[PDB]
Symmetry: D2
Subunit: 334 residues, 4 copies
């Protein structure tokens, strides 16, 4: 229904595309990339992590054709030149990684679009949303440049929401054992971050994350109560959050796991899942939820310090929330 345009046809850009194909409410009519249609059609058809796309893909001139629909393929390095308005695009997904500042992201609006969803933490954005935690704070009038936050923040926020409301989080540290991303290096090569400068598939690479501090933008109550780090490991996709926290009310594994299970079956259904199976990272590849509690790993010490471990396919889960936010925004009035 609502026309959408994607800027930056990379891992997130192509994954939001795949997720958007089976969504009746949105319609991607134009993509922007810094490469030819043929290369784009090839990368969309074949995926090393997600397999072949369940649709017929072809190239008509400089345009792609997916399941009969022709997709306009642009090659504008400068956002203000995209001309979204002329082709009817109401919402633009900004996933290049270059326009995270509201100043830069707003150019899409100069170009004619009505709303911009930055697929990453932003700077000066009108609002940051985490489907399931604060999408209710969205106002169609005061918010145009929106951030969907990071994949880590999307996994952590839903369950921190439940533990906090139910027992009260006093403070806590987190660690995400994350698969490698395109921001790293294949072999030792220059990087602003000396850890990420190192061969990705060869080591356990400790790095920084702002996802912990970022939860506060969606859960104000937790401001100053959380912090954490990342550890990038040799897997191509799927990551896990490991939260250790001091609760206010004394709990038991039994209690904690029931509260999460209840939320997964009720309120947060679709966003938070609950598992009592002893699965591993490969098993989570392709899951569309943002967070899945590994129930078998939940533990407590002295009734007040808990450990909760949650899985998340960083590409697929996040891509589904971008598509979800877009459909939610459209419903709010475009």
């Amino acid at each position: 229904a609502v026309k959408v345009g994607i800027n930056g046809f990379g891992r997130i850009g192509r994954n939001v595309f795949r997720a958007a194909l089976k969504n009746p409410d949105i319609e991607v009519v134009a993509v922007n990339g810094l490469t030819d249609a043929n290369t784009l059609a090839h990368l969309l058809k074949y995926d090393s992590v997600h397999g072949r796309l369940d649709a017929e893909v072809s190239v008509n001139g400089n345009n792609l054709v997916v399941n009969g629909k022709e997709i306009i393929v642009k090659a504008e390095r400068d956002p203000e030149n995209l001309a979204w308005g002329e082709i009817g695009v109401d919402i633009v997904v900004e996933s290049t990684g270059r326009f995270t500042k509201r100043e830069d992201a707003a150019k899409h609006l100069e170009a004619g679009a009505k709303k911009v969803i930055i697929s990453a933490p932003a700077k000066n954005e009108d609002i940051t949303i985490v489907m399931g935690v604060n999408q209710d704070k969205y106002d169609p009038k005061a918010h145009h440049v929106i951030s969907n936050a990071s994949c880590t923040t999307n996994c952590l926020a839903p369950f921190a929401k439940v533990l906090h409301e139910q027992f009260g989080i006093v403070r806590g540290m987190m660690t995400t054992v994350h698969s490698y991303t395109n921001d790293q290096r294949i072999l030792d090569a220059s990087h602003k971050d000396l850890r990420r400068a190192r061969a990705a598939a060869e080591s356990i690479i400790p790095t920084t994350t702002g996802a912990a501090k970022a939860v506060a933008l969606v859960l104000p109550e937790l401001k100053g109560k959380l912090n954490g780090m990342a550890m990038r490991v040799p897997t191509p996709n799927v990551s896990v959050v490991d939260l250790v926290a001091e609760l206010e009310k004394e709990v038991t594994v039994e209690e904690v796991n029931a509260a999460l299970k209840a939320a997964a079956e009720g309120e947060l259904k679709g966003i938070l899942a609950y598992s009592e199976e002893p699965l591993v990272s490969r098993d989570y590849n392709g899951s569309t939820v943002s967070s899945t509690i590994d129930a078998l790993s939940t533990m407590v010490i002295d009734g007040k310090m808990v450990k909760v471990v949650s899985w998340y396919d960083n590409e697929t889960g996040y891509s589904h929330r971008v598509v979800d936010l877009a459909a939610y925004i459209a419903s709010k009035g475009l």
Copy 2:
């Protein structure tokens, strides 16, 4: 001086050997595997993780020859048939992973050996020692079957001891992001642990660890205060401990780090180390210390909750401690 024999020439058995070539106090006189000397020689000479052994290694008859020294090669499934006494073996490193219970390890004593060091967490052992922490508890008269604990416990106990004495741990949780071991499966196969049954090099595998609570054996004061889990990831060697503890005092990163830095250059020298460089797992391959604090990762919330991350070569560090333990015990009198 002390003549040592090794039961089970595997990853740990072979590294204990390599570590022993160094210490002149000890002398390996025989090894027992379940294969021919030719195979043992090769595996000793070429290592996929630590490189070629720098020494003259050959096969003489059915014995190993390393830098002129003939090493006896046995192939006894039953330790009761090892006859250590015949060949004068004073101490035996039990590294098969099959005889961790007092009932099986003791067979080495029955065969003529004076002391047994179990290269793993044991059962019904006279004592469990972690060098740098409780070797002082060693009684030559009473202790004959001694456990050298696990690679993780050897990493954790040393710095936890320092945080406890200095600030007092109220309670804490840990996660060890661990390289895979021979205990896992190369491709999906049967295993007592359904997590470890999965292809080791393809996923992040949550698995339990007893190392956290096994700390109370060496630092009794900490019984019931710590707990934790493990996560096996696609790397052949080197692991990291991630400890989040609730302290009794208010501290700063500068304080916590200054404490760990003081211990490393002082009392725990050679066992505990301190690092301010932003390194990755491959950089600690070959590290002989037990624990190396990653200063750059030290974090604190409310001045009470702390995050300390420490590295350890699981094969090298651990194997050096076995050799250390063997020379200490020997010095106490055999």
Copy 3:
């Protein structure tokens, strides 16, 4: 209709089961594995390479319940005590890798099975068959212990036949760049093959193969004409055969590719495949055919020497052939 029993529920045994779920002509009624039903049900449901089973799996007592049908689980180490005839088993897929010699494979016949299909090269078998190549040489009266050859031979024979019938192979060499299998070690440990003894996911490991010479069994004319080797690399599944041969006729890349494409759409349809896309191994994980020509890699020098490269998912393609054989056998008259 036909009742099949699988001996050894490993990588090949489980995939054969999966493939069989498709075929209604066959019906797997019993499996034998040296583990409990619960572990078999887990390993069957979650696969690190092939994903989750698209079927409802559960355990009822000591049995497997899959899609309502109850599968009998056995735990007999000795084939003699399997009593296949007691349970109606007509065909037995021998996939343990321990009974490839006639003396052991036949024990199934003696236990009541009418036919045995060995999922690997055999010794003293009645006939070695590669579907599409020589299945017509199957005499239901004379043949009871049948070998289905190796995954490699299965990949090479269908197109080696075509190149030969059309151009005539003088002599040729082949190398298969193969994924690692459960026969290798995760870390340096004992093995009869000192190459396969090394850390699987860390090196390119040359090893031997009999596939090249084994083509002679299904294509008698090529005896003494081919030979080859293997190179095990750090990928979990999917391999590729690289053939270099001298031909009788002087050809061109279009001629060679045209003949290979023709067979793909004709005689060898379903067994041999043709591809002109620039794909990679991960793209072939899941392919049911035995061989797929990477057309873009075909090369010729002097018009007489040719290079052909063919892909094969060593687990899926082979397991589909096993089920294809079981079905062809049943139809011939059991």
Copy 4:
């Protein structure tokens, strides 16, 4: 004594530096890299593939200090502005991979350098040199812009020479099972070559190589007689050349190997090596020769079709050859 400058401080640049430390004839006095002195010292100190550098590496101002010797650090995107002349730099190693046409490389000479060695195949270079094969064709007057060829070409030419001079090569094919390099993608992303566009550590990736044809540049009698392909696989370093050739003279496995062993011990000593041990790729990491014959893999069919497999550390072997070339050139007067 011959002052050398390295243009481009990556895998080859840093490795030429390390090799250079062991050479008496040359002395690296300056390095141009598009990054700060701090980042370069870190990347030079810690290598994920070759380990820690055994030398004191520090940074004084914008310069590097390695074992008391200071190195000038530059950050010039444009070669013309490097001013090699002002600092006594005679030879310049061009290892950026950007300036391979004689036209671009020559900018170095304009900037004061006297000689340029391109660490890669070039376009219009004055001469291409494979040490041990044709360095005698170098002329100090007429050749100023020299190409050192590719790592694959340096591995193949030394033994191609021996096989040709000894038995006569009619024609042949080769495949190099090659480790990945910085030209590949961490995760599916754009690239000229759609195969190198795919996640490097996840698949067996076929690709093209001009190494076979390039042998004709240094071995003219071999023009149009060889061709081949490459296959990138999940290993960070060490590669192997698989050569299948039709010989002129009838031979035997023994003659071929005795021939390669002889060259290894004689004329090609230092360039070609001979191994009768069943090793794996990790065992060749750090190897300084250009090519090591895996003797156990030599195969012959109809006494005419041979197969030789040779190992090469694409970074170390090649880097040493660059240092040898630079020193060879220097001995010829500058």
